[PDB]
Amino acid sequence: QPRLYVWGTRICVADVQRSFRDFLTTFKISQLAEDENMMTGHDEALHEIDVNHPYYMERLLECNDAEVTHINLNLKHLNAFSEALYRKVIAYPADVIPYLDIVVNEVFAERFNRTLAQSIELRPFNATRNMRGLNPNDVDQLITISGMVTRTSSLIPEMRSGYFQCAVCAFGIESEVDKGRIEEPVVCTNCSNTHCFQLVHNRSVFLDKQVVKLQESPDDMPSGETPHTVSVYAHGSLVESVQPGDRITVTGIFRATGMKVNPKQRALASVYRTSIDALHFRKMDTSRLHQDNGETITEERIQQIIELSKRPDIMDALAQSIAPSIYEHDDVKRGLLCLLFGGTRKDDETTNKTKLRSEINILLCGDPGTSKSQMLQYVYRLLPRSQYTSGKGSSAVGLTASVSRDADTKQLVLQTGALVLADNGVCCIDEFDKMNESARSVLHEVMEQQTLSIAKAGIICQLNARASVLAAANPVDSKWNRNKTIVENITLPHTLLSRFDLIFLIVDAQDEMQDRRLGNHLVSLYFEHVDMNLLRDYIAYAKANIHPKLSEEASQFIIEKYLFMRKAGAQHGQITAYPRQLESLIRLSEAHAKIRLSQEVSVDDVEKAFTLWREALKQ
Amino acid sequence: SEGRRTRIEDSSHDRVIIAFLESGIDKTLMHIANQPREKEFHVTILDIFALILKEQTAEDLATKSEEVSTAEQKKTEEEFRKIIENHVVKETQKRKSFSRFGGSYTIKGLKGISANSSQVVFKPIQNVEKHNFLDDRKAKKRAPRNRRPFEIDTNSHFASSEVRGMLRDMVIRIIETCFNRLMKSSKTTVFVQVQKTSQINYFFLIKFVLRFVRLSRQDHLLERISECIGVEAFHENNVQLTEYVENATTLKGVEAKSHGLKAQYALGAYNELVLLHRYIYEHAKEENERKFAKRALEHIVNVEEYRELPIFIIKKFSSSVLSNNFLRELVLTTHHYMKLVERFVKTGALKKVTKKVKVEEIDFQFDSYVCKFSNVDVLKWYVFLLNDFSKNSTELNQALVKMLHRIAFDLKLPIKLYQVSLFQVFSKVNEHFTHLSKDLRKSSRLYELYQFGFHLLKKFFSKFTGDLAIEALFWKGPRECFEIEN
DNA sequence: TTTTTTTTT
DNA sequence: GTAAGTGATTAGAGAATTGGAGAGTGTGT
DNA sequence: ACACACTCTCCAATTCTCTAATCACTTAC
Numbered sequence A: 001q002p003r004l005y006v007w008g009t010r011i012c013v014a015d016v017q018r019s020f021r022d023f024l025t026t027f028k029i030s031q032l033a034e035d036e037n038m039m040t041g042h043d044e045a046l047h048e049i050d051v052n053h054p055y056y057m058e059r060l061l062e063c064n065d066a067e068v069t070h071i072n073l074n075l076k077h078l079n080a081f082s083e084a085l086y087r088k089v090i091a092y093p094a095d096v097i098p099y100l101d102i103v104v105n106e107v108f109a110e111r112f113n114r115t116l117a118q119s120i121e122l123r124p125f126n127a128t129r130n131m132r133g134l135n136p137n138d139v140d141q142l143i144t145i146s147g148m149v150t151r152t153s154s155l156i157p158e159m160r161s162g163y164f165q166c167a168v169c170a171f172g173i174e175s176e177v178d179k180g181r182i183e184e185p186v187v188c189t190n191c192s193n194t195h196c197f198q199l200v201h202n203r204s205v206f207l208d209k210q211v212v213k214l215q216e217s218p219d220d221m222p223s224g225e226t227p228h229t230v231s232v233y234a235h236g237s238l239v240e241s242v243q244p245g246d247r248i249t250v251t252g253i254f255r256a257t258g259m260k261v262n263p264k265q266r267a268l269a270s271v272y273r274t275s276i277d278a279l280h281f282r283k284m285d286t287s288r289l290h291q292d293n294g295e296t297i298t299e300e301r302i303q304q305i306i307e308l309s310k311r312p313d314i315m316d317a318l319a320q321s322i323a324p325s326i327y328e329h330d331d332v333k334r335g336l337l338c339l340l341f342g343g344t345r346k347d348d349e350t351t352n353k354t355k356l357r358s359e360i361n362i363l364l365c366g367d368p369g370t371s372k373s374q375m376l377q378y379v380y381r382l383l384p385r386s387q388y389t390s391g392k393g394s395s396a397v398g399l400t401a402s403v404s405r406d407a408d409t410k411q412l413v414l415q416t417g418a419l420v421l422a423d424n425g426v427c428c429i430d431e432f433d434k435m436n437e438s439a440r441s442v443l444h445e446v447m448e449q450q451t452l453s454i455a456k457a458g459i460i461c462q463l464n465a466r467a468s469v470l471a472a473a474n475p476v477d478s479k480w481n482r483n484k485t486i487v488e489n490i491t492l493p494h495t496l497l498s499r500f501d502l503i504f505l506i507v508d509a510q511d512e513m514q515d516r517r518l519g520n521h522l523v524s525l526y527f528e529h530v531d532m533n534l535l536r537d538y539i540a541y542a543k544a545n546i547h548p549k550l551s552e553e554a555s556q557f558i559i560e561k562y563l564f565m566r567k568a569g570a571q572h573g574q575i576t577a578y579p580r581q582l583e584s585l586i587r588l589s590e591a592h593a594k595i596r597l598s599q600e601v602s603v604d605d606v607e608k609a610f611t612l613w614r615e616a617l618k619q
Numbered sequence B: 001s002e003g004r005r006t007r008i009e010d011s012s013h014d015r016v017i018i019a020f021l022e023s024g025i026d027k028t029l030m031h032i033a034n035q036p037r038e039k040e041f042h043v044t045i046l047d048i049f050a051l052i053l054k055e056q057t058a059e060d061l062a063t064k065s066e067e068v069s070t071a072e073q074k075k076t077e078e079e080f081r082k083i084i085e086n087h088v089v090k091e092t093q094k095r096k097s098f099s100r101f102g103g104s105y106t107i108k109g110l111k112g113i114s115a116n117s118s119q120v121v122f123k124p125i126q127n128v129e130k131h132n133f134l135d136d137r138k139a140k141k142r143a144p145r146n147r148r149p150f151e152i153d154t155n156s157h158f159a160s161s162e163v164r165g166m167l168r169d170m171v172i173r174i175i176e177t178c179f180n181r182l183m184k185s186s187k188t189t190v191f192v193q194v195q196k197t198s199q200i201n202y203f204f205l206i207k208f209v210l211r212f213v214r215l216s217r218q219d220h221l222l223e224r225i226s227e228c229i230g231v232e233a234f235h236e237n238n239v240q241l242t243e244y245v246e247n248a249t250t251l252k253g254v255e256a257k258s259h260g261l262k263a264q265y266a267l268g269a270y271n272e273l274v275l276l277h278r279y280i281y282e283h284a285k286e287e288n289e290r291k292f293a294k295r296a297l298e299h300i301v302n303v304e305e306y307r308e309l310p311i312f313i314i315k316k317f318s319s320s321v322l323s324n325n326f327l328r329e330l331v332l333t334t335h336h337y338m339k340l341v342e343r344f345v346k347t348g349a350l351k352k353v354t355k356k357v358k359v360e361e362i363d364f365q366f367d368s369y370v371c372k373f374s375n376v377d378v379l380k381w382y383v384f385l386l387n388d389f390s391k392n393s394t395e396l397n398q399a400l401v402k403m404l405h406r407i408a409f410d411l412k413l414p415i416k417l418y419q420v421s422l423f424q425v426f427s428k429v430n431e432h433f434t435h436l437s438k439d440l441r442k443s444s445r446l447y448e449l450y451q452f453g454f455h456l457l458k459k460f461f462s463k464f465t466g467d468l469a470i471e472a473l474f475w476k477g478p479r480e481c482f483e484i485e486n
Numbered sequence C: 001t002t003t004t005t006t007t008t009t
Numbered sequence D: 001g002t003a004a005g006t007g008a009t010t011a012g013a014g015a016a017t018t019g020g021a022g023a024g025t026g027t028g029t
Numbered sequence E: 001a002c003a004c005a006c007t008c009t010c011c012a013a014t015t016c017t018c019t020a021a022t023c024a025c026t027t028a029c
């Protein structure tokens, strides 16, 4: 009996398929600890996975009901079931993956007695290494690496089967493309002429392909190395599933290819180019506020959040849990909590444009050695979409967008900057007083109108940049000077200063008791905070579900407080108030009501917002 | 050069026909043709009416034309429903065929050309029987240019209801006013003349008119075509057909093709003569007419020249000088003639037969007559034409299957049909039937051929042996059949 | 071509 | 009617005509 | 140097003709 073997390895195909069928029908072990992005399915809207069944048999119900066409295969479960199969999967992905697919399709057809539009496809994931640690032994093996997405290409059509037509008698033949090659017919079987066919391109069949560029994480590296970049190829349904600015983990096959010395000729260079063929993208990360509009939270944790919101301590409880290693600065922590929550979104949905800004901007200004950079680092690490820039390390064009000439098409093309990557996120700008004036002056349009309009050679367009700006700086003399006023210790234009919603003056209150307490706190690092898992869910639920509106009493109160602000700002040696500060007060009031999970802004919320704004600046 | 036109609309020839008939000059031409005194115009008028009916068939005009636009709208919507569903199913099958990654594999148990080697494949094959030994690459061998089959193309279309109604009226008026006088005046002269083409026009017009009368069932018109009903018609037709076949076989080149073209039209006219005489003998109301038809049918069945004609033509067939249309016509002619001989044996009217030596009378046996067609030189062309089963007409498919079925189950001799070149046809038919559900298979028009292939292959595999599988590679003669059987 | 960066006058 | 002899038909081999594939060589980019 | 085009040569297929063997018909007992 003829039998099929993988070339040079003595692996037979069917004996693997038997064990994998057993794995699919039988595995139920890990379901006590189901993961965050894997514990829900759906027939319509959303539904929750049951523990007690065979797990992938349960997951196949989603393919029947919601007509999903893929299964995410966690390889840790397979390794727990049988290492003898896990080794074969990792060692020969280019040979065994075309048959585990067929076992899945067989089990689906047997279970449901049904067909589908496309075959159910496998995506193995969660097999980790570094980009520099790859060797020639790893060619065609399964690997997984992580990084940030900087750029994505436009789509490329890749043919799978061509269509020939005879020039003499209009007969037509199909021809499969395989091993990278097509076979051309020579003799027409109808009219019996030779060397006679012509390929018709638009009658043939193509597939999608995309190129994605990935960058090293800087954390793990040894001494003196600069970060590397790698090309990742996405085929089929993975195409356009990721944006620039996202942080991801990729599982795929590591490959190597040759290159021609001249494009005209058959000779090849003996040093090969390398890339990755993708199989799975993962973006789930539990160390940050989650990136998914909070769709998957359970009813029980929603009720726990609703119960937690009724503490009178809710502002202090949420605020002091942020940045736990930082001592005191409670007012600054409350300001950062307001930055995290934000106001109500106010967009034109016909044009997809912001009518009014709802993001909150904060400046910190104070003495040296007061942990401003540390607070910036905490906010940078907490959020999913964040950028960090510092001092003279930035340019005006690099902060916003740049024009460069393309490598092959020789056209001028446009590419992103920090504020465009930080869209729906936070940009942290350290050493803000030491930037070049050219670099600092482009921030006006972004900080006010949340858009960015460009007019250079052949490029006239407008971009959206819905970012929040958090900045830190020193006074003119690096130590705060008491022989000068506030608008002389700070020196920025009024056009720039009026665009911040909060300014925090941090001046060293020199006192022996405060010195002793802070010294005890700092020395102890060498020897009722809300849980991070609850804080994540609280912020996401509040953002998705709470939209405060102003009450009429609150609106009258806001007008009265704005008149008081206009009188107070006019005195000598003080920051003047413009009509922009009325918008700032409305944003802060909505943020306080949003923290309380209230659909209406009250006079108490306006009072708390005004008190925070006033006491931030009276130093 | 003016453009390409579909097969279901009016030809450019039809517009000239419309102008010609709207002028009414055809009535004057018919009036001239009716006069016995004006003989010199008659051959040309016959040529004119044949050239008018050049692009038509009798089946187009025989059915009376009627329509309702409600039914037409419903019918066209169902046609495009068929087209849309075919496209969606084909595209989803093709896009589901593809597979993602590659590799290379060894088929353990199959030998390679080079020593100690197993077979190697470079695509993820589903199962070992899907392997093909890369026959898709290899270039097909061609016949030389002198020996390829060729069709003869007549621009043939389903014209509009207006043109079909006008032509139907013209055909009926010709039969009523001209036909007997015109044919009687022509037959004395057409074969004496120097010019060749009026012979072809003569045979074409005979074939068209007799088929139109039989299919339209206008039985009162049978008096008007009485010039063609006699035994003399069969005699004269047989003489001309024999001369054309001999010249086409013995000459070479375009001259041989030119004589074979005459032979084709003569054969078609002969077939219409046979079918018309059977229709008269079955459905005429007057017993005198029935007796007149019956005596002619008995003459055809009795005399050796009419009974030996199909084998005589089949043994001389050659694709260098005769068209495929000739072979299809010959197969259908043989089918109808053998049905006539079978009925005249079954009713007992044929028992003893005259044979040349002096002439002597010997008993006749229908199985002895059928056994002549089991020769290899006949069965070659039946297997040749069975390859085109997916585009043959249903009548031709029935004729081919019936001739094979007689040898399979009336003479009961399946060893002569055990042959590889027929098993290839069965393989194609089976692949065609895989794409249909069990109900649609019984609904299909090819189910007769499928069922016959089923029974013959089961009879083959009932007693399979390896030496029998070797014997399937060659055509088997009579002693070969005896020694294989015994 | 036009655009962006870092050393020099 | 049966047996033996002679004539005719069929099968094989040799020779000549026709056509197409393949390989080699020359020229142009 | 490499690709493309053109020309020449050989070999195989087919058909006619001649020769030999086997089968069938005719003649004689």
Ligand SMILES: Nc1ncnc2c1ncn2[C@@H]1O[C@H](COP(=O)(O)OP(=O)(O)NP(=O)(O)O)[C@@H](O)[C@H]1O
Binding pocket: A325, A326, A327, A328, A367, A368, A369, A370, A371, A372, A373, A374, A375, A473, A474, A518
């Ligand atoms: N209240 C505090 N809580 C925690 N760490 C503190 C505190 N005050 C000072 N530190 C420490 O002192 C250092 C402050 O550095 P840094 O974060 O740069 O402050 P800074 O405001 O940015 N000063 P500078 O950037 O020079 O203007 C860090 O090592 C902190 O850990």
Ligand SMILES: [Mg+2]
Binding pocket: A372, A373, A374
């Ligand atoms: Mg610092």
Ligand SMILES: [Zn+2]
Binding pocket: A166, A167, A168, A169, A170, A171, A188, A189, A190, A191, A192, A193, A196
């Ligand atoms: Zn063709």
